[PDB]
């Protein structure tokens with residue numbers, strides 16, 4: 203079965219690869235800008251991993267109030283060390299994206315709630331979007347970008363997928379993790395269903411889901427919504 | 432929780448009341464004329480109820496190709512019998528306004544797609560408008576007129592609401608359903624959001640939401656758009 207967290211040497215390796223390849227976060231940062239991210243806002247990043255996005259965002263936007271959340275304590279610890287390494291004061295938090303638990307003080311407070319390359323791992327996708335919309339304030343936006351199931355790739359997209367898999371500088375284990383993460387990723391319609399389910403509970407004034415590739419290097423699923431005011 | 436369909440004897444009763452109050456549709460019929468309705472067009476009515484609009488429209492515009500759709504089979508049942516009773520030839524279908532399922536043959540075919548006093552009942556309002564824009568031809572129009580949430584009534588508007596309820600010739604059980612329908616209605620801004628959303632997915636050349644009362648007897652929300660040309 204699919205595994206949710208990334209732990210131990212897997213996580214150190216995820217952090218080594220990631221923080222050298224900053225370029226590949228640019229797609230996500232650009233969506234945030236399009237989503238209305240701005241100085242002084244409160245931004246919650248669910249499944250924050252080793253903190254790369256947090257370092258990028260604080261560097262670009264020193265004004266932001268950032269809270270990273272991850273289910274893997276090791277990731278939380280790596281992130282804090284990485285923050286210290288970069289001389290930054292960032293809040294990291296142990297937590298499950300599938301529930302508000304441990305984040306009750308953030309309920310209705312985030313200007314933006316976001317997750318990068320993580321929600322495909324969730325056991326209950328609708329619960330992830332539920333947590334996002336409950337954390338975000340009325341009028342605020344949520345953004346998820348995560349992996350698409352292998353069955354929704356067309357021929358050119360799949361060629362690009364295999365080519366991407368080959369061209370990366372990762373080992374046997376980390377190749378398999380990333381491929382397996384697509385084996386178990388939700389389909390496009392699964393994303394649309396999950397977000398629709400979450401919006402039945404917390405109304406949105408806008409929603410949108412699509413698949414493209416604007417820089418990461420394979421197609422990923424974009425899910426955007428704005429909580430109704 | 433809010434309910435979508437109107438069923439059984441409540442639908443028989445709905446029909447009994449509507450049957451003898453054609454005048455209450457004049458406001459809606461007048462808006463269709465403003466929307467560009469014309470003889471020989473194909474017109475889909477979503478959430479058609481017991482078919483009163485279809486009887487009125489076929490009488491006023493005899494060669495319109497009218498398709499009524501409703502989630503209540505009993506409403507469909509009623510509508511069909513009522514059309515036969517009136518000696519008219521009219522297609523009624525079972526279906527959900529929140530999706531094109533069962534209406535794929537109408538996709539992109541309607542010159543007008545309309546719904547009267549029903550969209551406030553939908554669980555997913557944006558999907559209602561999506562089905563509307565998808566059923567209409569490029570260059571065609573959509574019109575929804577439906578109920579306003581109680582929170583968007585100003586004082587005079589609300590006084591009217593109470594007075595309308597009082598002086599309607601109908602029983603306790605009917606009043607409550609009509610009141611509850613407003614209790615659960617979208618706010619004005621919810622209508623604006625749901626239509627913009629539907630228009631993000633199917634482009635419009637024109638749209639407009641407003642609130643007034645030109646005949647029905649309370650303020651209702653009007654939603655109009657024209658699908659962009661191909």
Ligand SMILES: Nc1ncnc2c1ncn2[C@@H]1O[C@H](CSCC[C@H](N)C(=O)O)[C@@H](O)[C@H]1O
Pocket residue numbers: 206207208209220248249250251252254255271272273274277297298299300317318319320323324
């Ligand atoms: N249910 C859950 N709640 C919170 N974090 C979770 C989670 N399931 C998996 N994760 C975390 O999701 C992350 C996937 S890797 C993505 C890390 C980071 N968002 C980035 O883009 O670089 C891991 O850190 C993993 O521990």
Ligand SMILES: Nc1ncnc2c1ncn2[C@@H]1O[C@H](CSCC[C@H](N)C(=O)O)[C@@H](O)[C@H]1O
Pocket residue numbers: 435436437438449477478479480481483484500501502503506526527528529546547548549552553
């Ligand atoms: N999701 C849905 N899809 C189709 N019809 C629906 C629906 N939700 C409610 N309805 C129908 O909406 C109608 C509301 S009563 C309005 C009837 C008619 N339009 C008229 O103006 O007289 C009922 O017949 C009910 O069954």
